[PDB]
């Protein structure tokens, strides 16, 4: 019998590598035969046995004749959808798992939960489903767009943790945290320290005692707030990441926000969801993170490191470590995940690459993905091979 | 080692929400380069592990050549097909189960049992398959149109109860019950009381005692007939819905039947298959039901909610709990059923939304999705997204 | 662990039923998006667990553009493939086996065998595989088209009995029977008596003691040579049907082939595989058999049943049944199987339905399946829907 | 439970027949509907229970918009792919296990462990997936194209031995072998003996103690280098085959290379990826190997034997065994795999039959099988089928 799965020390490794390409749009010719499914928000969640690539699709292929709003965000036909990883999301190959605007899952051990927020601006609802069975809810607290993750919710031991956030994307959007365990929400818990914006958490454990967040502060600065959760008692604190390496985009020149670790700085307005894994050792913890190339436009996408070290308090730079998708092409949304080995895991980061020809034709994405593996420089880049007139 | 199942109690929950939709016909565009199948009379059945979404097709693709005898309902093309609840049902997708023109379906904790009626208006037959077993069949018995549920039939102990029915569409339709065991009839039940037309019933587990059905009587009324079945003696009784809020379609203004329970009324010839599905609790039952926004065209679809009482005997309004589809959508057959969670059960209401465009095109449906799940109140509607020029 | 499988007794029933129509070239047309293959042959073995469907492919589609040679039975390209019996057979769908342009299969309990000929006229191959691995070959005896059943061989306590033929199409085919365990020929069985011309058996077991299979007699006859092979000695003997009720196309009036049991009669010339089943009961034996409506061409065909008796000196006539396919519609090759319930074996027969429009555009064939279930009369025909201009 | 494997004796047999062609663009026609991925150095390999069918992709499907570039051999979307042997690789059947290309893959007993090579030329990157997880990697040692087999590696004991080689294709390349277990490099192997240049090592189990490789030298000679690794102690030692049957292409011809074994002699400039499988019987070893038939081109492959001896010391030409496929057909790539059977292993080779139009076009290959089976002579030869220009 399947038991409750924690996190474990990682792989050994020292650099990132390129891993895998999936790039359904490479299929969607009209001179071609192929039905790749129209998506964005891709992230992935593994559990022991499988690795599955989530998006939130409009119900819609490519080539097709309903382009017209796949650059928008919520409407009445997005659904969280999943294809097992190394799969190209079609049509026929995909599992459409319930309407959604904005999703989550992840893996506890024994069953995959599946978390997706529908229904209209003013009033939206977090939906909660075990395996195939639609288990609970959960109701908009500041009934402005509640919304979540877009990346893999954490489980240890049968709990699972999960960002959600309500609240104006150009103002106060405080998050908040569920715990959910077997598909139902057992606790809700409320953040102290800064607050006053963060959303599309990527969540991931620091060791058995912590989940660490960086999110996303759509309004007030381009510093990411820096989650710390720690799940034996229940409680979290957010603050600023301090490093001069602003991850956010836009963002102003690295360093050049002057005052205390807290000073939100200029161009905060605007933003993207980031990036950000653990690799953690017998006495250090590795924090990986991405951002744009770009310091304005979501195209580019780099890699960083930092060992050890309070994200709060380090001012210091982060490691630049590679160029994982050129200043050339897209680098959108970017989220953290692990692959189980069969003794350690494997931590991987996986890059949104949205194909962006305006709103006069599709809007869709590939998704690139690189991973810890053995030790040297990064080594190659990834490009989405798509040319949008076919 | 699997054992029969039985009904339990339903999970926690005070109302539905949308859950899910299946719109193949999203990617039936000439554009396009996919192929869900034609079909109508969907719905859904679980067993402990896994929902399988069943329709029954007029063996055609959109696109195709083959639109031409789509709306019509009994031909020697029509089979029962499924796929797994999620999947959309395309040509490569979808199993086809038997040669069929009206069906039935369901788990009985240890194999699928498979319902199939084919065969002319006169004599028809009701097939039986047991896991991949053709293993019974059973006759006409007033020779006009043998025919059965469109929805899942009900499983206790091994042993599995179906509605079916034969006779006139516009005059006498006296329904039967069928207990059938591994794939073999054991049993007919003939039931008593207000028998003269019942048909395409959607039943359900009241307890493990009584299967509740809300039938339709597409000749002299607009209220349901409702079926009482003792399983623990094998025997039936049939008595008119009592409630002011008719179920059927067309229907006169709620509450405008004038007289007893009993009374027939007018605007009673047509119906719907309507939705209907039990929330069993420790000391109380919900009747959930489902029926369309308008009181005499198959557009949109409400839900409504009874706990307690006799369904004979209670004049009293349904609440209305929202709206599933508006009255700007389809709203065509409906069906209660029901999700195995790990320890109880989910109930659930689908909705069979047709795409008519008249006889000189193709002529199929979507299926939504709605679930007990959470608290609070129903929050939104489904549409299919469907332009039928495409 | 699975153990071998043995006949059992069949299943109660008394007359065939329509069952299921795989018809792929109703999702073939120009305008449509499906790729059904090309094939002829089919037939269906069945194991403790699932049915597959099998056929002969050109190693193309439908729409396509290499449907010249389609109409041609035997090149270089030809292969086995298969799917679950219920799914549409299409280029991905299936699964290719072997290269062949002849074959067989059936499941031992433990695993499938494989059985396919190809090579050059004058000195083609049989070859086995069992299950993934290729295991052994038999070499032509006559240098003129070695050729096998075109239906499941037949697998008792492991030993797996097989019908091979080699020799003129038009003049002397004298067939042999290999024993066959875990994929490895292990012995030889030559028939005595009437051994002119055998080919294309349809054999299944009347006891666990008897294999019985009725043949095609290409040259001599239009009276099915009928094989009695006694597995427990492994040998096996064959004479002519007796049977008024003459099985093959073309043939002359019932009845009309004058003196003893053993006359060859006019009209002999020619000849199709016919279906044959056996329904095994306590304390008798049904034999069911197919033959087209039409004495001279392969349209329509009906269902016949003798019980008991011996079949080399019974000159009764065999007892219609019903017709499965209309004198309107192809009737092609005919082939027995038995699919597996829980405690008893179910008797089918499947028709190739073929769609013929001459060599200048594309030959394959649709598969419609009767089998014994109920009581009563044989109530429906079977068409396959098909515009072959589309 | 599974446990380790190991090479057994090889299933009874005397000479190779034609198995199974895997020719997809059969279904690339752009009247048709279906999706062959662009593939080139297809390989299989098998473990206890399946057997999968390996290729590099270029991430484009015929028909369609992207064939500029496929004659190409290295770049940023070459993905290394598989599906279950049997089945077409198509857009949706194939699964993307890594970007890659140069590629080799392996079962261990209990898991798959996938090699991809890519990188930029000067730094490439060997990367090695275990199961579901990115495990390791190995980096370039002559900054030359590091790249590996293009073929099967070889498990014993949980024990996998690789290939790998890095060089100018026209000069020096050194190959290296690793040692892999549970996807970890866990020893490099340097071979001695003549190692000026070896690549694309075709290998197999000798025996329990030897894994034997027959490679190709693209810079120097048309003779095979071979490879003797004692799998006992670690190390490997390499030589020219003396036979005088040559089997590179191109190559002079056949014993026209004076001088003792270890003369390179003329045309040995160029090569191509030979075919090498051994059958290992309780007293002897077989090895089968095949060669184009075209001294020049890559047009046809026939299949030669040579039972014992020292294939570093023997001059004598290897016996003909057939032609697989004709010199009218294309013969590109060709590798050795064999197949598990229940109590022993069954060689087979595979042929890349590559579709050369030129680089205005497409480019990919089908797969032809050949395997030892029964006894005889070879019977058959393998044609693709396919018109380039559909
Ligand atoms: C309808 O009747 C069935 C059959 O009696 C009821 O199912 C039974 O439910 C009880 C309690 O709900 C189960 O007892 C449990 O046994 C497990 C061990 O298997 C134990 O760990 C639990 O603490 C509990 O004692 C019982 O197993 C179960 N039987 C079967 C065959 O499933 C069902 O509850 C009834 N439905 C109603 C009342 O709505
Ligand atoms: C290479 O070495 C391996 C490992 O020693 C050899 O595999 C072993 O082969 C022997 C006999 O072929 C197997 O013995 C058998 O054991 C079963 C019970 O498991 C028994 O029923 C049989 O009668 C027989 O005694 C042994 O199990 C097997 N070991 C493993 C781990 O597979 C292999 O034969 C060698 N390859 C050669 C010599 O080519
Ligand atoms: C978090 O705690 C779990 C629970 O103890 C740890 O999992 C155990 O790891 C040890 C070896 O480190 C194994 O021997 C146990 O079998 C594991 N138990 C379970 C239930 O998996 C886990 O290693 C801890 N994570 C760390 C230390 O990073
Ligand atoms: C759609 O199908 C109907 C019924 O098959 C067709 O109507 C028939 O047309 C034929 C003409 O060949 C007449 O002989 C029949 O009497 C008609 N039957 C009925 C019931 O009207 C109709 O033609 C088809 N439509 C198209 C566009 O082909
Ligand atoms: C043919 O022989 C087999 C072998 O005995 C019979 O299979 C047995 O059937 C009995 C009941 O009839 C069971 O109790 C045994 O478990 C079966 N054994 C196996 C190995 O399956 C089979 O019934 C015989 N076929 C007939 C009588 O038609
Ligand atoms: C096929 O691809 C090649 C390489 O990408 C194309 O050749 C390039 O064409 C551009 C023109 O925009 C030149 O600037 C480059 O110098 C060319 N590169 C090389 C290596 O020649 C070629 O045009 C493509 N073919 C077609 C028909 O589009
Ligand atoms: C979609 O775009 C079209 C223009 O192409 C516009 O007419 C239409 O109103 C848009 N859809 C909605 C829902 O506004
Ligand atoms: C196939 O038919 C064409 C005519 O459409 C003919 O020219 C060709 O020769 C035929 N193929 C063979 C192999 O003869
Ligand atoms: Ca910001
Ligand atoms: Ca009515
Ligand atoms: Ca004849
Ligand atoms: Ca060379």
Same mark, same amino acid.
């Given at each position: 019998?399947?038991?409750?799965? !924690?996190?474990?020390?990682?792989?050994?490794?020292?650099?990132?590598?390129?891993? /895998?390409?999936?790039?359904?749009?490479?299929?969607?010719?009209?001179?071609?035969?192929?039905?790749?499914?129209?998506?964005?928000?891709?992230?992935?969640?593994?559990?022991?046995?499988?690795?599955?690539?989530?998006?939130?699709?409009?119900?819609?292929?490519?080539?097709?004749?309903?382009?017209?709003?796949?650059?928008?965000?919520?409407?009445? /036909?997005?659904?969280?959808?999943?294809?097992?990883? +190394?799969?190209?999301?079609?049509?026929?190959?995909?599992?459409?798992?319930?309407?959604?605007?904005?999703?989550?899952?992840?893996?506890?051990?024994?069953?995959?939960?599946?978390? =997706?927020?529908?229904?209209?601006?003013?009033?939206?609802?977090?939906?909660?489903?075990?395996?195939?069975?639609?288990?609970?809810?959960?109701?908009?607290?500041?009934? *402005?767009?509640?919304?979540?993750?877009?990346?893999?919710?954490?489980?240890?031991?049968?709990?699972? !943790?999960?960002?959600?956030?309500?609240?104006?994307?150009? +103002?106060?959007?405080?998050?908040?945290?569920?715990?959910?365990?077997?598909?139902?929400?057992?606790?809700?818990?409320?953040?102290?320290?800064?607050?006053?914006?963060?959303?599309?958490?990527? &969540?991931?454990?620091?060791?058995?005692?912590?989940?660490?967040?960086?999110?996303?502060?759509?309004?007030?600065?381009?510093?990411?707030?820096?989650?710390?959760?720690?799940?034996?008692?229940?409680?979290?604190?957010?603050?600023?990441?301090?490093?001069?390496?602003?991850?956010?985009?836009?963002?102003?020149?690295?360093?050049?926000?002057?005052?205390? &670790?807290?000073?939100?700085?200029? *161009?905060?307005?605007?933003?993207?969801?980031? =990036?950000?894994?653990?690799?953690?050792?017998?006495?250090?913890?590795?924090?990986? !993170?991405?951002?744009?190339?770009? *310091?304005?436009?979501?195209?580019?996408?780099? /890699?960083?490191?930092?060992?050890?070290?309070?994200?709060?308090?380090?001012?210091?730079?982060?490691?630049?470590?590679?160029?994982?998708?050129?200043?050339?092409?897209?680098?959108?949304?970017?989220?953290?995940?692990?692959?189980?080995?069969?003794? &350690?895991?494997?931590?991987?980061?996986?890059?949104?690459?949205?194909?962006? =020809?305006?709103?006069?034709?599709?809007?869709?994405?590939?998704?690139?993905?690189?991973?810890?593996?053995?030790? =040297?420089?990064? /080594?190659?880049?990834?490009?989405?091979?798509?040319?949008?007139?076919?």
């Amino acid at each position: 019998e399947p038991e409750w799965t !924690y996190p474990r020390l990682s792989c050994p490794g020292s650099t990132f590598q390129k891993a /895998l390409l999936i790039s359904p749009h490479r299929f969607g010719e009209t001179k071609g035969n192929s039905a790749p499914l129209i998506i964005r928000e891709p992230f992935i969640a593994c559990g022991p046995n499988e690795c599955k690539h989530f998006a939130l699709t409009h119900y819609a292929a490519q080539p097709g004749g309903y382009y017209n709003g796949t650059r928008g965000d919520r409407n009445k /036909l997005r659904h969280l959808i999943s294809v097992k990883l +190394g799969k190209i999301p079609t049509v026929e190959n995909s599992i459409f798992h319930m309407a959604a605007w904005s999703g989550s899952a992840c893996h506890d051990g024994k069953e995959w939960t599946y978390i =997706g927020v529908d229904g209209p601006d003013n009033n939206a609802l977090l939906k909660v489903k075990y395996g195939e069975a639609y288990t609970d809810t959960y109701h908009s607290y500041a009934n *402005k767009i509640l919304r979540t993750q877009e990346s893999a919710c954490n489980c240890i031991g049968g709990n699972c !943790y999960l960002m959600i956030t309500d609240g104006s994307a150009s +103002g106060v959007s405080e998050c908040r945290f569920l715990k959910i365990r077997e598909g139902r929400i057992i606790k809700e818990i409320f953040p102290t320290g800064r607050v006053k914006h963060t959303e599309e958490c990527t &969540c991931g454990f620091a060791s058995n005692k912590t989940i660490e967040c960086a999110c996303r502060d759509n309004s007030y600065t381009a510093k990411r707030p820096f989650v710390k959760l720690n799940v034996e008692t229940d409680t979290a604190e957010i603050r600023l990441m301090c490093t001069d390496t602003y991850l956010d985009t836009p963002r102003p020149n690295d360093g050049s926000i002057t005052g205390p &670790c807290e000073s939100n700085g200029d *161009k905060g307005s605007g933003g993207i969801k980031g =990036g950000f894994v653990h690799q953690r050792m017998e006495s250090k913890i590795g924090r990986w !993170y991405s951002r744009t190339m770009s *310091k304005t436009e979501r195209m580019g996408m780099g /890699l960083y490191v930092k060992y050890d070290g309070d994200p709060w308090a380090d001012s210091d730079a982060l490691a630049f470590s590679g160029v994982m998708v050129s200043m050339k092409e897209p680098g959108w949304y970017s989220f953290g995940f692990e692959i189980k080995d069969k003794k &350690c895991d494997v931590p991987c980061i996986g890059i949104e690459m949205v194909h962006d =020809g305006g709103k006069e034709t599709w809007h869709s994405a590939a998704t690139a993905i690189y991973c810890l593996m053995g030790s =040297g420089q990064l /080594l190659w880049d990834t490009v989405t091979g798509v040319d949008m007139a076919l």
